[PDB]
Amino acid sequence: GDLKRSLRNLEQVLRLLNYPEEVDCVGLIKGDPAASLPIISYSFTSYSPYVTELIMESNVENDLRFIDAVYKLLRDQFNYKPILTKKQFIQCGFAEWKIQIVCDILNCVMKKHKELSSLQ
């Protein structure tokens, strides 16, 4: 857990994703899930038309179900198992690890888009 490293990884990843919204810096540092969910949500709904078509085809979304759906999506479609459990993510703490999971999810979305746009 290195807060500075994780935040710098997120800045670089948000830059590559062209995330257009303002980021809740205070919430991320405090490990608040509410600061991570809008970023993950944006990458699923608004980043790529190919990634978003795949996601909207299976599951549909108060975000207690949102965390469960994201975990199932990452396991099935992106072959990603987050480091924290579903309850370690919903509870406050492990801030550096939640930040890196956002970076990982966003890297999965972007590598999935590059792969899907290729075979078209």
Curated annotation (Swiss-Prot):
It comes from the Eukaryota. Residues 8-120 are annotated as: Binds with microtubules and centrioles. It is found in: Cytoplasm, Cytoskeleton, Microtubule organizing center, Centrosome; Cytoplasm, Cytoskeleton, Microtubule organizing center, Centrosome, Centriole; Cytoplasm, Cytoskeleton, Spindle pole; Midbody. Interacts with CROCC. Interacts with POC1B; the interaction is direct and recruits POC1B to centriolar microtubules. Binds to centriolar microtubules. Centriole-enriched microtubule-binding protein involved in centriole biogenesis. In collaboration with CEP295 and POC1B, is required for the centriole-to-centrosome conversion by ensuring the formation of bona fide centriole wall. Functions as a linker component that maintains centrosome cohesion. Associates with CROCC and regulates its stability and localization to the centrosome. This is Centrosomal protein of 44 kDa.
